[model samples]
Target chain A: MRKIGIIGGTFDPPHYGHLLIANEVYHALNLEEVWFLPNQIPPHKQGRDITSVESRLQMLELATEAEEHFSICLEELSRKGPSYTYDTMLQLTKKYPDVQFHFIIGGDMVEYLPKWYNIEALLDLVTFVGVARPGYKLRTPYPITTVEIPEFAVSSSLLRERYKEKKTCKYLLPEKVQVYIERNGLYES
Target chain B: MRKIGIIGGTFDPPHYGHLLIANEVYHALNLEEVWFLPNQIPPHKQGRDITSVESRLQMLELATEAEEHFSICLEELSRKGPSYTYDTMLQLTKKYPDVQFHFIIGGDMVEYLPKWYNIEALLDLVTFVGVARPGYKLRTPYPITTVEIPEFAVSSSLLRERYKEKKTCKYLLPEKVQVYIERNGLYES
Candidate 1:
């Protein structure tokens, strides 16, 4: 039986840290492949101004172009709006039911797993791999198998701020995207 | 002799995590008071766009008002230009010579102690009480004392983004500053 890992996030600019996490999970979990999914619209981020789906997809492409196990999924990005985790899990599981599906999330998200829409059912479908954040602790009673990944304190908002202010994001963002942001005022007003 | 603990940062907007760290450190270290000093012009953040010194001081005051042991310091904020740790230490030492000063910093900063300007001299001035960032590891040639605080993954940048985007920074930032951010378009360009 093959094991596949799925990492879902907005991936607005696909920072180096995100790539590092995916790589760590992939090797640690012995995953056949790690799929990085960009949400069409994150439900939790309902009213926020997200970069266009096309732009996000391209950024992910640029970031993961070199890695063999790292792949991009456009299914959620192709969906209408407010991407649901359950819905995404179902779609992926249906396609690869024979393979074990593991969903990677921050420990904070796992603590609130019970509150998610159809979370009980969602738990039944995929195994969760929780990475520790700086402050949040997982508080779920359910006996979910977990894999702890080391923390990296990088935030896209910080990168966005750097971009907006015309400062050097240095190693935070992809060099190509950094140039793109400079060419077109993406974060800047 | 009263032991003084210093939690130093830009503190763009003071958050609950900041308070929690100070609280935990105070108990663990048995320090009499924890001074929350908002950086006027951090050396590392020389060219960065930050919240105004007046604004940061106001937010710090609001976040720490209820805590008796936590006090706000204006020495660095009152200084004109780039605030270096060594210079700050020198000034603080003169004022509180009898008091043992413990400079509170994250694990990442502790790791980079050698890179800091006049770090050896600074160490002689004050002992460092290193607060661990979730994933930070310590490896130094010189002997330095450290205390690992509870891993809290809440980043100030994340809180800032959530506040700026009008999302719920509920548990992340102080309620007072959350209201302040809303009242004044602080994060919004």
Candidate 2:
């Protein structure tokens, strides 16, 4: 079956952890290309403070330029409201019927899947793949695959907080993304 | 004689080159400490756009914090006019008469010593020490000593240009200095 891995998140500030997760899934599952789907308005972050779509997209683009098999997906960005994974994955599955999509998330979420909007429908549309996040135990009732990575547990929220506080997120984030954020004066209100 | 090394520069953005030069001179000559003197207003760059004194000193401080033997000399910052080496050296030698100061400069300046103001008096106050810079030939008629360093040719002006141009000066500059520059929004005009 044709395969493409998908990683969807707010990606408030995409870090190396995101890449490591996608890369690990892609290699382990024999994926075609890993799609980085940065949500337009995250289902949880409703009318809240977040970096604008344009800047986030620019950072997203910068993060993927170095990796050949990594791709940036803009499907969720064009939609108007909060992006539910079920709705987004449904649309993608219908559009690309032949491609078996692998949806990736942090390992922390693997054990906490009952909170998802529509658990049953999402399971049919795409395979759930969880990558290790530091301090998170790996146990899930669902059929989500787990991929091992170096003990990197960087979070976008953490990076945003650090950069806003004028702290260094060195090695945790991409160099190009750092340059872009610094250039645009992002996260430093 | 009590030996100490001195590095005087605009240091708009101090890079690895500055550290490498100071380190080479420090190890080779067995100097007690290497003093990084950030000029108030560079003698050659009067009435020109430059990073403010406070931020430059902050970055200079950041660059030296990791090195045990590195020191920041605020003498040049105290003076009002363009910082000519001779005037600064005279004041320093008078203040610390016991210390034999070794004034460090890029190898490019080693061959161009004739243009310096009060070169004779400056030579009498501090022995001129030169560290190799890429593309700069090592030929000096004066009694200035040359120290060998790894062929690192990074410049503060170059780093300033790169950060301003939204380019990564990775590996050419210290991590703390890069973080300082990014945090304070320096050289990003």
Q: By TM-score, how accurate is candidate 1?
A: 0.52
The reply for model 2, stretches above 4 Å from the true place, is A42-49, A133-137, B1-189
For every candidate, how close is chain A to the native chain A in TM-score? 0.85, 0.91
Q: Candidates' TM-scores? A: 0.52, 0.50
Docking class of 2: incorrect
lDDT of 1 by residue, A85-156 (tens): 899889888987897888887665676877888888988888888876434456778766555444544566
Question: Candidate 2: what's its TM-score on chain B?
Answer: 0.90
For model 1 chain B, give the 10-residue run with minimal summed lDDT: B163-172
For TM-score, the strongest prediction is 1
On DockQ, the leading prediction is 1
When candidate 2 is compared with the true two-chain complex, its DockQ is 0.02
lDDT of 2 at B154: 54
